[PDB]
Design an enzyme around this catalytic site. Structure first.
Site, short mmCIF file in Angstrom:
data_model
loop_
_atom_site.label_atom_id
_atom_site.label_comp_id
_atom_site.label_asym_id
_atom_site.label_seq_id
_atom_site.Cartn_x
_atom_site.Cartn_y
_atom_site.Cartn_z
N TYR B 127 10.32 -14.45 0.49
CA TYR B 127 9.10 -15.14 0.48
C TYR B 127 9.61 -16.72 0.21
O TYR B 127 10.49 -17.12 -0.39
CB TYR B 127 8.05 -14.98 -0.90
N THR B 153 8.88 -12.25 5.10
CA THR B 153 7.23 -12.16 5.40
C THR B 153 6.82 -13.59 5.78
O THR B 153 6.94 -14.41 5.12
CB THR B 153 6.93 -11.39 3.85
N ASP B 155 3.34 -13.28 6.82
CA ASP B 155 1.96 -13.48 7.02
C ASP B 155 1.17 -13.75 5.43
O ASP B 155 0.05 -13.46 5.22
CB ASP B 155 1.41 -11.78 7.36
N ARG B 162 -7.78 -10.71 -3.46
CA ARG B 162 -7.86 -9.15 -3.91
C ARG B 162 -8.98 -8.90 -4.90
O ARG B 162 -8.75 -9.19 -6.18
CB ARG B 162 -6.46 -8.59 -4.36
N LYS B 206 8.37 -10.06 9.18
CA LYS B 206 7.26 -8.93 8.64
C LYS B 206 5.94 -9.67 8.61
O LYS B 206 5.83 -10.50 8.02
CB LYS B 206 7.68 -8.43 7.39
N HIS B 230 0.00 -6.16 6.45
CA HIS B 230 0.17 -6.38 5.16
C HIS B 230 -0.69 -5.20 4.29
O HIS B 230 -1.08 -5.71 3.15
CB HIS B 230 0.15 -7.70 4.62
N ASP B 261 4.07 -0.68 9.83
CA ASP B 261 3.56 -0.25 8.62
C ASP B 261 2.04 -0.37 8.57
O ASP B 261 1.47 -0.74 9.36
CB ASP B 261 4.31 -0.92 7.21
N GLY B 262 1.62 0.34 7.30
CA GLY B 262 0.21 0.08 7.26
C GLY B 262 -0.39 1.81 7.15
O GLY B 262 -0.42 2.19 8.35
N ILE B 264 1.07 4.69 6.70
CA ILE B 264 2.00 5.95 7.02
C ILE B 264 1.95 6.81 6.04
O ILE B 264 2.33 6.70 4.92
CB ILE B 264 3.18 5.59 7.42
N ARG B 265 1.38 8.05 5.82
CA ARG B 265 1.20 9.05 5.11
C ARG B 265 1.82 10.36 5.28
O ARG B 265 1.27 11.51 4.47
CB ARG B 265 -0.14 9.30 4.49
N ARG B 285 2.69 1.99 -0.46
CA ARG B 285 2.06 2.77 -1.44
C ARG B 285 2.39 4.25 -1.89
O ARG B 285 2.54 4.31 -3.14
CB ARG B 285 0.56 2.66 -1.40
C1 LIG Z 1 1.38 -3.70 -4.61
C2 LIG Z 1 1.73 -3.98 -3.63
C3 LIG Z 1 2.82 -5.06 -3.60
C4 LIG Z 1 3.45 -5.59 -2.26
N1 LIG Z 1 4.17 -6.54 -2.30
C5 LIG Z 1 4.79 -7.13 -1.07
C6 LIG Z 1 5.72 -8.05 -1.12
O1 LIG Z 1 6.33 -8.61 -2.32
N2 LIG Z 1 6.24 -8.58 -0.10
C7 LIG Z 1 5.89 -7.99 1.36
O2 LIG Z 1 6.24 -8.58 2.41
N3 LIG Z 1 4.98 -6.98 1.17
C8 LIG Z 1 4.42 -6.57 -0.11
N4 LIG Z 1 3.62 -5.61 0.05
C9 LIG Z 1 3.02 -4.82 1.50
C10 LIG Z 1 4.05 -3.74 1.90
O3 LIG Z 1 5.27 -4.24 2.16
C11 LIG Z 1 3.23 -2.97 3.09
O4 LIG Z 1 3.23 -4.06 4.00
C12 LIG Z 1 1.86 -2.48 2.78
O5 LIG Z 1 1.93 -1.73 1.51
C13 LIG Z 1 1.49 -1.78 3.78
O6 LIG Z 1 2.19 -0.28 3.79
P1 LIG Z 1 1.41 0.94 3.14
O7 LIG Z 1 -0.02 1.20 3.70
O8 LIG Z 1 2.54 2.00 3.35
O9 LIG Z 1 1.33 0.66 1.47
C14 LIG Z 1 3.00 -5.08 -0.93
C15 LIG Z 1 2.00 -4.03 -1.01
C16 LIG Z 1 1.54 -3.75 -2.43
C17 LIG Z 1 0.45 -2.34 -2.06
O1 LIG Z 2 0.21 -19.28 -4.36
C1 LIG Z 2 0.30 -18.01 -3.84
O2 LIG Z 2 -0.65 -17.63 -3.49
C2 LIG Z 2 1.58 -17.40 -4.36
O3 LIG Z 2 1.28 -16.08 -5.02
C3 LIG Z 2 2.45 -17.11 -3.32
C4 LIG Z 2 3.36 -15.82 -3.19
C5 LIG Z 2 4.12 -15.63 -2.02
C6 LIG Z 2 4.11 -16.42 -1.04
C7 LIG Z 2 3.29 -17.57 -1.00
C8 LIG Z 2 2.27 -17.75 -1.87
O1 LIG Z 3 2.58 -9.24 -1.59
C1 LIG Z 3 1.79 -8.59 -1.64
O2 LIG Z 3 1.27 -7.53 -0.80
C2 LIG Z 3 0.96 -8.64 -2.94
O3 LIG Z 3 0.44 -7.39 -3.50
C3 LIG Z 3 1.58 -9.38 -4.34
C4 LIG Z 3 0.73 -9.92 -5.25
C5 LIG Z 3 1.24 -10.43 -6.34
C6 LIG Z 3 2.60 -10.83 -6.49
C7 LIG Z 3 3.36 -10.23 -5.52
C8 LIG Z 3 2.92 -9.54 -4.34
MG LIG Z 4 3.02 2.29 5.97
#
Ligand SMILES: Cc1cc2nc3c(=O)[nH]c(=O)nc-3n(C[C@H](O)[C@H](O)[C@H](O)COP(=O)(O)O)c2cc1C
Ligand SMILES: O=C(O)C(=O)c1ccccc1
Ligand SMILES: O=C(O)C(=O)c1ccccc1
Ligand SMILES: [Mg+2]
Ligand SMILES: Cc1cc2nc3c(=O)[nH]c(=O)nc-3n(C[C@H](O)[C@H](O)[C@H](O)COP(=O)(O)O)c2cc1C
Ligand SMILES: Cc1cc2nc3c(=O)[nH]c(=O)nc-3n(C[C@H](O)[C@H](O)[C@H](O)COP(=O)(O)O)c2cc1C
Ligand SMILES: Cc1cc2nc3c(=O)[nH]c(=O)nc-3n(C[C@H](O)[C@H](O)[C@H](O)COP(=O)(O)O)c2cc1C
Ligand SMILES: O=C(O)C(=O)c1ccccc1
Ligand SMILES: O=C(O)C(=O)c1ccccc1
Ligand SMILES: O=C(O)C(=O)c1ccccc1
Ligand SMILES: O=C(O)C(=O)c1ccccc1
Ligand SMILES: O=C(O)C(=O)c1ccccc1
Ligand SMILES: O=C(O)C(=O)c1ccccc1
Ligand SMILES: [Mg+2]
Ligand SMILES: [Mg+2]
Ligand SMILES: [Mg+2]
Lengths: 335, 335, 335, 335
Positions: B127, B153, B155, B162, B206, B230, B261-262, B264-265, B285
């Protein structure tokens, strides 16, 4: 504490008398067009762009000669004292403070001059009267009071058949009146020309769904159109505006502003409308939910929520301006 | 005893505090994009081939200079100590043992150097920070620790809205911290170039959904992209990656690896992604469900299950290699 | 008293042990392909013709050198003594009496010679064994016993993952055995050629879904194919045969018989399959429902019901012959 | 108090014996075609026109040489004394008073001469008999009695399989008889020619779904066709007429009147049918609901309701005449 527009509907459901909630929520016939407004939006997915400069994200637009804080205006909704004692004044004050245009109704429950006095650069919605002279006198009143656009509703030759209201035997409470009056006839293209000839304000035709009616609106000198099936309250079975919007935007090819309404319930929905080509949206029922739930402060909270959702959606989609959002592509999905 | 990935969700549902399960499960807004990731996969049907030689079926791929045991990697998921006390170490150990790449997060709850020390040829997710120098220092740390790709990342100019977390008033427990730190700014194409110039590792973007962003990624020197919304946590209404994947694979025409991704189960879902052209998938997840349910052994069981499902699906579809699976045709169906 | 095939499922549900009902009813994985077989048929509507001569309506066809009373055969279903003590003999007797071909299974619970002795011009289904010589000895047994076609199942390099059976811990009762035996290997095109070279009987490849595999089947000397995803029991996510049938019929352009199976549950479904171009259908689970419900008489009643439904549907659609039904057009609808 | 056609179904549900309600409501087989008639209409959305002259809106049409008050006729429904003691006389009186054509059935429970004596310019529906001479004698009776069109039903070579009736063991009460009689054979194109040669009345073929049968009907000298799957009571799986209507209207290119039936339940549905090109619609089950609920007065109320709904829908869509409504465009939506 509201984090979505749906929070406010529940709150309004709590407080309003059932028959009044039904007047607000209902559509005509089987409510197919009412439901389709939501279905159609839910089928639209945005293709966001990444890695753009977002150092000056702005949700502002210029429309009908004035800056608005969001690509949104409050839709005309008649008789707002049905929902809260301050009625139109509460809503117009909140809209003013949020920098959003407010549409004053022909059938407002507070006089158009009182609502215009609130300030905030208001629009005026026209229902065609009986005789041309009285219709034009309403337009002249609006212009004299400082309204900045005439929103001529063109999809109501007469009111639709709202079965909830029929079943409830709903009628105006004696404490609610049409405050602009002390009768209506179907509008035609001749009526539009009479209005256009009588005012320097932009004339906006609300309730256009056919592509050739959109073209004819531009030819007729309209400054804008609202692509709309009147919240599913007029022809039951009328296509949702959001389904005609792209075709219509292509057909007018910049000749007028193209707004859309029907079922806008979030900043993400505003983004979808913009991506399909809308200049701006109208929002109707949610504003009344907020009004019913908490009066002026309720409408303020709603508009603050929508402002944050629109900014959020635009930035996540890589758009630093509403113009950029209009250049986003979309993809239709399922359910 | 787990015979599907759904068995593990139920188990994780059992054990986790509600608010933490919601942080994991949730999406942004109305969760339309979250649901659509699953809907979109369920609409895809594979056209299997028969009577092929399956005497040496292999699920291995080469990606970013290394062999992987499956066309799959563990997605970046922040703060894994939320789900189990061993957090990232448990997951990275199981991934190592399974021969699957593990993506170390910028917001990991165990330091990237500790997780990299587990072994197993890890990736690092970036990030973008505040200032270029600290972002690049994170990249340099990752490279020094032996990470083999930088998953940038792209996006998340900011985090999505949320609503489950808002309603729950969810915040990090005091016992969970961002272990790589003792602030974030939106990434741009300039940021990508800074990273590309500062490392010899492949840079993987990503969160790409638009075809022209995929092309621009290749032009920018990316070694890969992850086609992704995401997990429906960013723009609510963003198209599912699986719906853009085929178009994107055609547009880059072999110029970089294209992951998806997204939702996949199952191994069958991996096969669908491959048949639509993906090099590999990420899984998010479900890995956390397994972690919550049974720690390292849970993640081991999940990866063993997915390995057997991928082999099964490939063989039943007549594919002795992942390359063959990418040449399978698909047909869209209903529900 | 049965007026639809659904009456018999309820009856079989009554009588069978749960685990055995699940072995019969289930599919692989999430059962997506199982459900899709029904969904796909339900989307197909026939465009019937009117005012035709129906003075000699006949449901008979000629296939693999013999007349059949309906464009239908009993699908291969292993281990029929699971469902009734008379097992395969009850079903083969009812099929004989109805003038319908019966497919004897490699994994039959009564020996193929006993079932063939029932009469009624039977087919034999082959699963490829271990070594070519034993596979070919099975084919020679079938031919010596009077079987009239070899139905080579080509979509089972190994058995699919049936989660109901895994969860139930289902295994063959000690009282059910593979009666043709006192081991299996994946079939390839080489295997098909070995069979073709070793018999004068028509070879029918069951489990074809890709258009180029259908073409290759004709090139390989097959007398027929069955377009089939194995009742959703093999690859979960495999397209339904009914969705590939039209394309496949066009591609083989009369070069072999094209059968279809999966979800045929009425005479109207038979008509749909015919209108999409099938020579004939196979019916699997409903025959076992009838067997479980009432043994030989149950299967007799089922086949009488299907015969009346096929005649009814054909006549209502203006078809005096199955050839006429193949010239009907169809239209895809929703739900 | 009825504000929709659905109000009357509930009322008829109240009063009728279950088996008789099932005879009325049911379809053949799984009732797929019955349900699809409604599904197909619900998918159609109208694109209304605005700002038209509506000073002389008329719902009248000219058809088969006579003016009708609405673009609608009462469908042939056999044995109406099943639903009310006055049976056909009650319905024909209400239709006469409403200015709507009434179709007298071959299997009417009151003689065709009695029903024709009611007045109101009636049509006569023919089922083909045994021998040409008796069929033609029925046609001659109808013409002598003043019927103005012969509606030859062409989709009933025999009656469909109505499973509700089979399960109920439904048969005619002894108090209901076929009053035109003191036997049936499938109609063919030869039969149509015999009728055409024997009468000067327009011959209308009811039950056409294939485009080439519509063309052949015009070539055969038909004055009209009814595009219809017989309310889903004949071939289960037959396409809804509303799905074939546009194609058929284009193919006959004004060569005969094109009517449609199946699931018309509101004035908005009439508008949809008109917009897809129908000359007029038939309405079946709702008329019987009204008859069961309240006899002649019930049918009167139904026709008054439909008249107001048709006028409402036409005006809201900008149509001053039914011809204008036929020039409306439509768009297919989802659910
Ligand atoms: C709890 C949680 C935390 C996540 N944290 C990050 C993250 O720190 N950086 C990132 O690029 N994606 C993050 N993601 C997105 C995942 O990398 C992935 O794109 C997303 O979960 C979709 O896949 P899934 O349906 O298999 O969960 C997070 C997703 C979840 C659910
Ligand atoms: O300010 C935010 O939303 C902060 O949580 C964040 C985290 C990662 C990338 C960009 C912003
Ligand atoms: O990146 C994410 O998908 C998100 O779940 C998140 C929220 C807070 C902190 C780091 C990641
Ligand atoms: Mg997936
Ligand atoms: C209670 C109510 C009253 C309305 N009154 C008017 C009106 O007076 N003039 C008008 O043009 N539209 C009127 N509308 C239609 C709205 O302007 C708008 O087109 C419609 O509500 C769709 O938007 P929504 O889904 O956001 O509510 C009214 C809608 C409602 C629900
Ligand atoms: C319990 C069961 C056993 C089966 N055994 C075989 C088999 O031995 N060989 C084979 O080719 N197909 C076998 N099949 C598949 C059927 O031949 C057929 O393809 C499938 O059941 C789809 O048809 P249906 O929906 O009519 O059941 C079996 C199916 C079931 C349900
Ligand atoms: C109870 C019943 C009896 C019918 N009898 C006849 C008949 O005698 N002749 C005929 O052509 N159609 C008959 N029909 C079909 C109708 O004319 C019409 O095609 C059908 O009901 C579809 O219209 P609906 O959905 O408005 O009911 C009958 C339908 C019903 C429900
Ligand atoms: O215009 C409308 O949408 C409608 O709700 C209405 C009904 C009565 C009076 C004014 C408006
Ligand atoms: O007569 C009506 O339907 C009346 O309510 C009305 C209101 C506004 C415009 C046109 C008609
Ligand atoms: O072939 C099959 O469809 C399957 O049901 C099966 C499972 C075990 C043994 C034989 C067949
Ligand atoms: O090993 C298997 O899966 C076995 O059950 C089998 C049965 C038939 C064909 C191929 C394999
Ligand atoms: O024609 C029909 O639709 C059908 O309902 C019927 C059944 C028996 C007698 C007459 C008509
Ligand atoms: O034999 C029949 O099905 C009979 O009910 C009938 C009725 C009308 C037309 C054709 C047949
Ligand atoms: Mg809106
Ligand atoms: Mg079948
Ligand atoms: Mg009808």
């Amino acid at each position: 504490t509201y984090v979505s527009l749906a929070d406010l509907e529940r709150a309004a459901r709590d407080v309003l008398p059932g028959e009044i909630f039904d007047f607000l929520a209902g559509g005509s016939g089987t409510e197919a067009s009412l439901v389709a407004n939501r279905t159609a939006l839910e089928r639209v997915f945005v293709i966001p762009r990444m890695l753009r400069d977002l150092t000056d994200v702005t949700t502002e637009i210029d429309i009908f000669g004035r800056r608005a804080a969001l690509p949104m205006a409050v839709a005309p909704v008649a008789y707002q004292r049905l929902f809260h004692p301050e009625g139109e004044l509460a809503v117009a004050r909140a809209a003013r403070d949020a920098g959003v245009p407010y549409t004053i109704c022909t059938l407002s429950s507070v006089s158009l001059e009182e609502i215009a006095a609130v300030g905030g650069r208001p629009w005026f919605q026209l229902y065609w009267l009986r005789d041309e002279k009285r219709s034009l006198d309403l337009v002249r009143r609006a212009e004299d009071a400082g309204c900045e656009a005439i929103v001529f509703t063109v999809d109501v030759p007469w009111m639709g058949r709202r079965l909830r209201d029929m079943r409830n035997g709903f009628a105006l409470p004696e404490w609610v009146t049409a405050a602009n009056f002390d009768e209506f006839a179907p509008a035609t293209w001749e009526s539009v020309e009479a209005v256009r000839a009588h005012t320097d304000l932009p004339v906006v035709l609300k309730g256009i769904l056919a592509v050739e009616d959109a073209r004819r609106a531009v030819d007729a000198g309209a400054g804008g159109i609202v692509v709309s099936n009147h919240g599913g309250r007029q022809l039951d079975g009328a296509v949702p505006g959001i389904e005609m919007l792209g075709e219509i935007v292509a057909a007018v090819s910049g000749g007028c502003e193209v707004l859309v309404d029907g079922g806008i319930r979030s900043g993400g929905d505003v983004l979808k409308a913009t991506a399909l080509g809308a200049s701006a949206v109208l929002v109707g029922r949610p504003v009344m939910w907020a009004l019913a739930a908490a009066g002026q402060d309720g409408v303020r909270q709603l508009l603050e929520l929508l402002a944050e959702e629109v900014r959020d959606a635009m930035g996540l989609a890589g758009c630093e301006s509403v113009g950029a959002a209009r250049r986003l592509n979309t993809k239709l999905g399922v359910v």
